[PDB]
């Protein structure tokens, strides 16, 4: 276990556009025909989303390059993957992603999804080891490839899988598996909408909202991010001679939510059907100011949503000596 599955060299990541995708429900209360404004962590419109060819095929001799690098979780992660083969089947959320501090693990097998919060000694190259055990005639799935050991377990959540059982393609179609992860005030929030996509290359200019799915009480610090891939042995063919875990191809997308102010619109059925980013464009700021999508002809004064604090600076006097609070508090006679 914990073998080197990646090579010593990598490639620069591909950059593509988020064509207005990734809005989620920020409240569980039904709202009908309400242009309600809400401030929360939202993915900016027309932003760079990092394309990650985890397994990229190129010609014949250059069979495949494997790369699933650890990423900073930051404010939150917008995860979209459009692979019919069900190669992507889990994620690992954490800090050290080591046994020093606890970490989250969502593994989505066919039978059930398992969410465990333990101190996981993860492998350097985490993946799910699908294999065939001759004894029960079962292609069985091995988790030991994800982490070496699990200890001090604090959570366990078993429920229905949420990937539509990896079926329903019906030929010449693909499913966009979108996910949004947020860690606020000790709660983990996952939002997910899965839709049939026609263009297999990039994101739809189409608009969809991400339904609330689960709100696990994980209670852990989450500064780093990585995904779990499903790989099969390269001894698949008789006479083939490779022990590597080579399989399929993965083309997931990772986007980072940033704090923004949005004017979500709720349709009669209660479904968000359109949304406006206040900072995206001067017109969108006019729509935010008027609180209406239709803006009449003329001149309008608009309030500020465009600029955000990039960093923080603190300026204190040059002070070296500590205060004698130990002198005052620990005095023998008062």
């Amino acid at each position, epitope marked *: 276990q914990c073998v080197n599955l990646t090579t010593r060299t990598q490639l620069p990541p591909a950059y593509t556009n988020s064509f207005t995708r990734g809005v989620y429900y920020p409240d569980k209360v039904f709202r009908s025909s309400v242009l309600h404004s809400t401030q929360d962590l939202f993915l900016p419109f027309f932003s760079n989303v990092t394309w990650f060819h985890a397994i990229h095929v190129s010609g014949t001799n250059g069979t495949k390059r494997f790369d699933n690098p650890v990423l900073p979780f930051n404010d939150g992660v917008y995860f979209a993957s459009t692979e019919k083969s069900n190669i992507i089947r889990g994620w690992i959320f954490g800090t050290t992603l080591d046994s020093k501090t606890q970490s989250l693990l969502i593994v989505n097998n066919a039978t059930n999804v398992v969410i465990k919060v333990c101190e996981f000694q993860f492998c350097n190259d985490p993946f799910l080891g699908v294999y065939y055990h001759k*004894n029960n005639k079962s292609w069985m799935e091995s988790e030991f490839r994800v982490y070496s050991s699990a200890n001090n377990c604090t959570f366990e959540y078993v429920s229905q899988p949420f990937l539509m059982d990896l079926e329903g393609k019906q030929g010449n179609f693909k499913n966009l598996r979108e996910f949004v992860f947020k860690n606020i005030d000790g709660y983990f929030k996952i939002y997910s909408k899965h839709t049939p996509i026609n263009l297999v290359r990039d994101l739809p200019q189409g608009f969809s909202a991400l339904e609330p799915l689960v709100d696990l009480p994980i209670g852990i610090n989450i500064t780093r991010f990585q995904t779990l891939l499903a790989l099969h042995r390269s001894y698949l*063919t*008789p*006479g083939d001679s490779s022990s590597g875990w080579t399989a399929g191809a993965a083309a997931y997308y990772v986007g980072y939510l940033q704090p923004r102010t949005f004017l979500l619109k709720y349709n009669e059925n209660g479904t968000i059907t359109d949304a406006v980013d206040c900072a995206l464009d001067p017109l969108s700021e006019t729509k935010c100011t008027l609180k209406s999508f239709t803006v009449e002809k003329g001149i309008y004064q608009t309030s500020n949503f465009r600029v955000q604090p990039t960093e923080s600076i603190v300026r204190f006097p040059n002070i070296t000596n500590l205060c004698p609070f130990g002198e005052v508090f620990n005095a023998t006679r008062f």
Partner: antibody
Amino acid sequence: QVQLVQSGAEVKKPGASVKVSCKVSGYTLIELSMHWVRQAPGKGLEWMGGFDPEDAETIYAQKFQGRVTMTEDTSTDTAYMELSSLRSEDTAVYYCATGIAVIGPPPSTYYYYGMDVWGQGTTVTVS
Amino acid sequence: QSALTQPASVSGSPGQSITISCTGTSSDVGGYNYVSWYQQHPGKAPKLMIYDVSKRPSGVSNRFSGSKSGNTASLTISGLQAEDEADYYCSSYTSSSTYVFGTGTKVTV
């Protein structure tokens, strides 16, 4: 990649029992179907000892039954064999063969009828 | 338990085509199309050249091919060189769940 290691030669006496090992590396025995071989000079090979991928069993030819048995240790990835009642007839070399359980991707359960990977073998001899 | 018939006395010139034949009973060879040949150099581990009658694995040259029709199975050797003089076997799965072999064939350049 997939390397099979053997236990070396064991010279014996007629009537005794021979114990042989076969160690895998780079790939696990739970994922490998294994066949045994009784290579001898001057005569072709015969199939005595195999784990059927199709049948979750380990059967042998009618000529060689009861005289030989198969015990498998999956913890140390070592494959074993007990022979019994060998009286001056075991002059042969024992190759440890193995092949794929089921060829194809994980959805595919198609069977494999092969003995693809071999070891260096063990040259047992009974005097 | 039985054995497959192989003509043990074969030879030929380099760069010439030789067909090596394997013939067996319906009980064994007749039951399936899974007969696979080998390439064992003396005192060496055997290699697999063709599987399931013709499908040849990666790492073998175009010079080795095979076909089985009716009952008798054949291994065809073309473009012969001096390193291919070896002892060859045919191996077929039977209805008794056994992979019986043949007497073997010795080719000499």
